[PDB]
Assembly symmetry: D2
Homo-oligomer: 199 residues x 4
């Protein structure tokens, strides 16, 4: 059905000094663009194999489908999770859910930071919503494996810990990047995603 | 177009005493039948998701697509790899390739046996053809991961080491099953698959 | 110090008609016995590699360490999770936690059944305790990957869905085995494991 | 047995302009150093669990052992695979093996480049020696999974395609990094590793 690179909801430098403009521009215009481009190529090749009934070709295409498809899913959410007007704490029912499920907002930040810094290799840290249990949940995903597609949790807030998300600015020091990104979390967007999870 | 369960090319009791009739009937009429049906179900849900551009739904279906699709691929080859007219050693160029790539037929049997008995959990041992290198190659695959779809090798001979392939007759002693199955290998079919790889 | 095969706490035929005596004897005296012995073999080779600083040899041994070590861990819990005095529903705080975290005992049974029947290939379904969140949690594990070692959840109740756990009696119909096993769950043991988690 | 960060066999700027000095210094003094440091911590924790017979703790430590242990193995080989005096083509039996197993030196470069650029996420491209088959073989490894520990192939030449190996200089354009690194391949070292594989 054709996938497209979404416009960034802000200027490439809007998240400075926490994530610099060179990273944002590369991350959106090169990395996410490649995922979209390679996803469209892979989807067309899957339509051919499916019409041909070639199951071997379908299975051979699965790694590229999950990698680029997950990449598209994850980054499309990620851009909306950040804002130049972000930072601080959420309000209302989301903040109450965070206190109820994690103890406090500070304890939640520790848990999500720990999950993000604990990713060995490329991956993502996620705050998600468990619809079956009706409460928040933190999970980590490898490479571009998307949260809902691989675990069923509804994504609320994602932290990209691929090296291209921080290396130009923070080099190997991923914890400095994790501390900085809290200043640009768009809690308005995370609240919207949380409210959508409830009828 | 759909996928269908192939008829077994021989009687359910044709491979006794090496593989008994209760195993052959369950393995074909229950296990393979389930894979083919569930593959068609999974493909239909993927057909819908692909047209809808729902990448999350596509990625969520990948485990079932590889598992049932691989199940169909692997067992369809497996039935042709066995025959009451089987056993012994291959002839002609396949035997020459085995001696060239593995040293001898007996050395090849140990390597394929070792790969099959070495599967921890469910899986398959494979003799394949490496098209890029132009020679034979042995590999092991977990669960129903199909050989060509996951490694690119062209399948020539597969050994199913799922417990349902032997447990009723050999119980926990997988090596006893592996010793017996050499008596029913259809080297005519494996030779046909090998000759198709070279041109 | 070594690891040893624990005696089964009941007769091999004590769980009939739900799990027959041939399965119980093979499962304990053949399968679990193999895991314990091979675990001790693998640990000794790792003991040597660790003292030698041979990291390649250590890493090569990890699949066998997790597989046989998990095999020992999982089955040692499994035997205590079953009893001829089992069946029915738990009492006290465990039942209260089940109702609180899953809605009802019946809803909990479906979720654990769904996780167990959903294992593609060999594996286990688990009811566990999340120490960080302080509540119950269901998870599925592949092959012999143990629950606490791979996810941190404390094991309370495990359902072995390897084919050797049911095939002789129920053949391919894993749901028939899952329905039967609820009749022999030792809720006294699961309650003991749950109460140890809270302090 | 205590692991230590090996000295780099050359100056941090010795591989310029192909890999810049900032990358080499970060790669050796920060990334490899961390692998060594975290490996030593993990090994000490494994000795405690092993003496305690805590198999759960051993299995929980396996990801960090493979990650940091593999990281140490892979980078220790990598530094020796490069040299300011490198580039060009190998001579003697290694060059003959490359021509025999891959067709030509240029075709081999294409195959190893393709394997390296094909790594989705973090990982490594390897030219290895298959001792059982007695010929060269190309393989790719995810994250820090070491070649010999996970596949049995003897490592001859490794290409690190983690983003920290090239991103500061080449950004997202991994193919430009792969083309440049051929100018500093230490074929003297690769030849030594190849000759050691033969009696
Ligand atoms: Mn990214
Ligand atoms: Mn089968
Ligand atoms: Mn078992
Ligand atoms: Mn590196």
């Amino acid at each position: 059905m054709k996938h497209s690179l979404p416009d960034l909801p802000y200027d490439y430098g809007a998240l400075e000094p926490h994530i610099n403009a060179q990273i944002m521009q590369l991350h959106h215009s090169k990395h996410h663009a490649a995922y979209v481009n390679n996803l469209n190529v892979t989807e067309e090749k899957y339509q051919e194999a499916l019409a041909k009934g070639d199951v071997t070709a379908q299975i051979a295409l699965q790694p590229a489908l999950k990698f680029n498809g997950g990449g598209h899913i994850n980054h499309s959410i990620f851009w909306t999770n950040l804002s130049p007007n972000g930072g601080g704490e959420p309000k209302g029912e989301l903040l109450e859910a965070i206190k109820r499920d994690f103890g406090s907002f500070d304890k939640f930040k520790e848990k999500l930071t720990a999950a993000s810094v604990g990713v060995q290799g490329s991956g993502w840290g996620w705050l998600g919503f468990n619809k079956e249990r009706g409460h928040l949940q933190i999970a980590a995903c490898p490479n571009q494996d998307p949260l809902q597609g691989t675990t069923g949790l509804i994504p609320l807030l994602g932290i990209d810990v691929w090296e291209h998300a921080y290396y130009l600015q923070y080099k190997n020091v991923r914890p400095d990047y994790l501390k900085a990104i809290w200043n640009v979390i768009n809690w308005e967007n995370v609240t919207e995603r949380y409210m959508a999870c409830k009828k």
